[PDB]
Design a protein around this ligand. Structure first.
Ligand SMILES: [Mg+2]
Lengths: 94, 508, 94
């Protein structure tokens, strides 16, 4: 109900918010089972695992979405069809 | 319709009894009809018709398959009602499976037209009973063996629309085994109602009962034990405790409330031998408007015992109220340091009313008001604003150690009350009441002899007040005197509001 | 009650500690409402939002302040007169 370019950022980030939650590289918020759970696709267990951040909001999100929309509920092993990712890296000057 | 049969469907996604959304529109019924479904993603009973009523008696519905729908990835139960009425009588509803694979939900009622009335039945599997999304359930004389009861949830990644769920319990007994992982034995999230009438709520990883995000929970003649754990955990929602009993371990509290919670305890009992009876805070929600400053009321003869009667988590305001002859012995403590040094903190306000009785000590209470009640003070104490009325008293407790006096310090004093105080005449020492900023009103002092036979007659300071305070005190021992051995003492105010107890040799 | 240079690091960071909390770039500690809140200067909504670290202590936490002093209570939307910031960045050798 809104055109893709409605969500284009100052620096031309396309679909910046309100389309998909992007996984973040921060941990905090809702923790999970306070006992060693094996949910890392067979690569060990996690104890009292903090949620991974998700930013921007998704298409369903309504008016929650935006440049600062943040959801600290989902564990790193959760998966949903509105959870994607965007990439970042440092600026190199030489 | 179904009689003494043995419907077993190992068939995958094959439901023991299924009633189609547009099947026949009428009353079904089944007796002694034991069911078993091993087929993965297939419930024992699935009711889906807003017009069909299913009556299930003396049977036994069980499933082993890994149940769950991909209609927003929520994992169903061995009997699921999504539309229509279910009537269960003397039934076993079991769900055997895995931890990681299945949740083990025995009963699942969800939807604006989903209804269930479990009577004399028993439900098991590590998922327990789950109700949500506008459903109505009534459970009587039954047992939730290991999975617990769970009404509503928090945000399923989207806007929660409205329609409330109502659940009524007639002396059943909900348990949540440590094995089941479940965080609370009973839990109500969102705008939903639970009425409990008698029974044993026992279990929970973290709490016995959890009510959050605007729940209404009426617990009546329930008994709540573990079997740091909390008895009842509240939020921004209403919890009422009538004639119930709540016990807590050393590491815990009988009640935790925070974020604008409203708790009423009438009758019953709350003990926490080595912990707190009531805890306040731990889950930050900061708004400048004074909403419903989280309040706890112990009324109608409530009993409450622990190492502290109220522990405040700091930087939320609290309003503790003992009324209707309730009695609580604890201590009332705060954290000493606030989280943010130099910001506003609201008050810790206690109100002792109609016949009530707190027995303890404090240096955390901001504003205490005793009114036709009594604070039995057990040790040195600090209160901001003190206010009395209608025979409100502050009974200094008689020390077991002779010579050991207690002192109450107060910022401001107002109204009219009585102070029972201890006197050690042979030592020339007495309990003291110090008011530091402002004193006013008519107060009465009643002296207790607690160190008999004085060598001489010697003055003993009893009350200290500011500049030229407006407060009057009068010795309430009859005839305005106390005879300690062969000596008579009277109260005299001297200079700048300092009321001492003078006395000399008693008239022959 | 004590001079500014008492709070001067080994590296010449002036007022290193106990003068003003600096906001940090790490999340954890006390979470906010486990429910969507539009408190982000009107740029979306947060949910179970963890505290954003505060370091050093300020002028008024006497004994509490210092190089490891840390407060994990404040939501990122909090604003007080004891909360400022100190910048950092990488060291580049070429
Ligand atoms: Mg980090």
């Amino acid at each position: 109900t809104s055109a893709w370019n409605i969500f284009t950022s100052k620096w031309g980030v396309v679909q910046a918010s309100g389309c998909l939650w992007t996984w973040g590289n921060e941990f905090g918020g809702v923790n999970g089972a306070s006992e060693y759970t094996a949910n890392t696709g067979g690569r060990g267990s996690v104890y009292a695992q903090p949620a991974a951040a998700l930013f921007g909001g998704a298409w369903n999100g309504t008016s929650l979405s935006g440049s600062r929309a943040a959801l600290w509920y989902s564990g790193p092993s959760f998966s949903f069809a509105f959870f994607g990712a965007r990439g970042v890296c440092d600026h190199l000057i030489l | 319709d179904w009689n003494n049969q043995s419907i077993i469907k190992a068939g995958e996604r094959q439901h023991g009894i299924h009633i189609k959304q547009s099947d026949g529109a009428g009353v079904r019924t089944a007796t002694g009809t034991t069911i078993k479904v091993s087929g993965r993603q297939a419930q024992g009973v699935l009711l889906e018709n807003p017009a069909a009523e299913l009556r299930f008696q003396n049977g036994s519905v069980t499933s082993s398959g890994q149940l769950f729908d991909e209609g927003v990835r929520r994992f169903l139960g061995t009997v699921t009602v999504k539309a229509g009425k279910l009537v269960a009588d003397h039934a076993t509803l079991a769900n055997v499976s895995d931890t990681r694979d299945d949740d083990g939900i025995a009963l699942y009622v969800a939807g604006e037209q989903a209804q269930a009335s479990i009577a004399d039945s028993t439900l098991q599997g590590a998922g327990g009973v789950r109700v949500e999304r506008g459903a109505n359930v009534t459970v009587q004389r039954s047992t939730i063996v290991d999975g617990g009861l769970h009404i509503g949830t928090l945000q399923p990644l989207q806007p929660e629309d409205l329609p409330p769920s109502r659940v009524v319990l007639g002396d059943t007994s909900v348990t949540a085994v440590p094995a089941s992982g479940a965080p609370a034995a009973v839990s109500v999230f969102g705008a939903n109602e639970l009425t409990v009438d008698g029974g044993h709520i026992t279990g929970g990883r973290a709490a016995g009962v959890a009510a959050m995000d605007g729940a209404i929970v009426h617990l009546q003649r329930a008994t709540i034990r573990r079997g740091g754990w909390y008895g009842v955990d509240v939020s921004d929602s209403t919890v009422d405790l009538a004639q119930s009993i709540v016990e807590a371990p050393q590491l815990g509290a009988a009640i935790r409330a925070g974020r604008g919670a409203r708790v009423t305890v009438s009758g019953g009992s709350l003990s926490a031998p080595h912990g707190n009876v009531i805890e306040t805070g731990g889950g930050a929600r900061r708004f400048p408007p004074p909403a419903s400053p989280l309040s706890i009321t112990l009324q109608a003869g409530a009993r409450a015992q622990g190492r502290a009667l109220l522990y405040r988590v700091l930087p939320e305001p609290v309003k503790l109220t003992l009324a209707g002859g309730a009695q609580g012995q604890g201590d009332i403590v705060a954290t000493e340091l606030p989280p943010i040094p130099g910001a506003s903190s609201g008050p810790l306000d206690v109100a002792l009313a109609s016949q009530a009785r707190w027995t303890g000590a404090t240096r955390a209470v901001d504003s205490l008001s005793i009114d036709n009640a009594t604070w039995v003070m057990t040790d040195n104490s600090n209160v901001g604003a003190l206010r009395l009325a209608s025979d409100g008293s502050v009974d200094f407790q008689q020390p077991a150690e002779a010579g050991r006096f207690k002192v109450l310090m107060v910022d401001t004093l107002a109204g009219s009350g009585l102070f029972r105080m201890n006197v050690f005449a042979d030592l020339g020492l007495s309990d003291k009441l110090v008011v530091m900023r402002d004193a006013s009103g008519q107060h009465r002092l009643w002296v207790r002899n607690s160190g008999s036979e004085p060598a001489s007659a010697n003055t003993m300071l009893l009350v200290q007040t500011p500049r030229g305070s407006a407060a009057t005190f009068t010795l309430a021992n009859k005839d305005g005197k106390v005879d300690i051995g062969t000596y008579r003492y009277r109260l005299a105010a001297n200079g700048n509001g300092q009321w001492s107890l003078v006395g000399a040799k008693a008239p022959p």
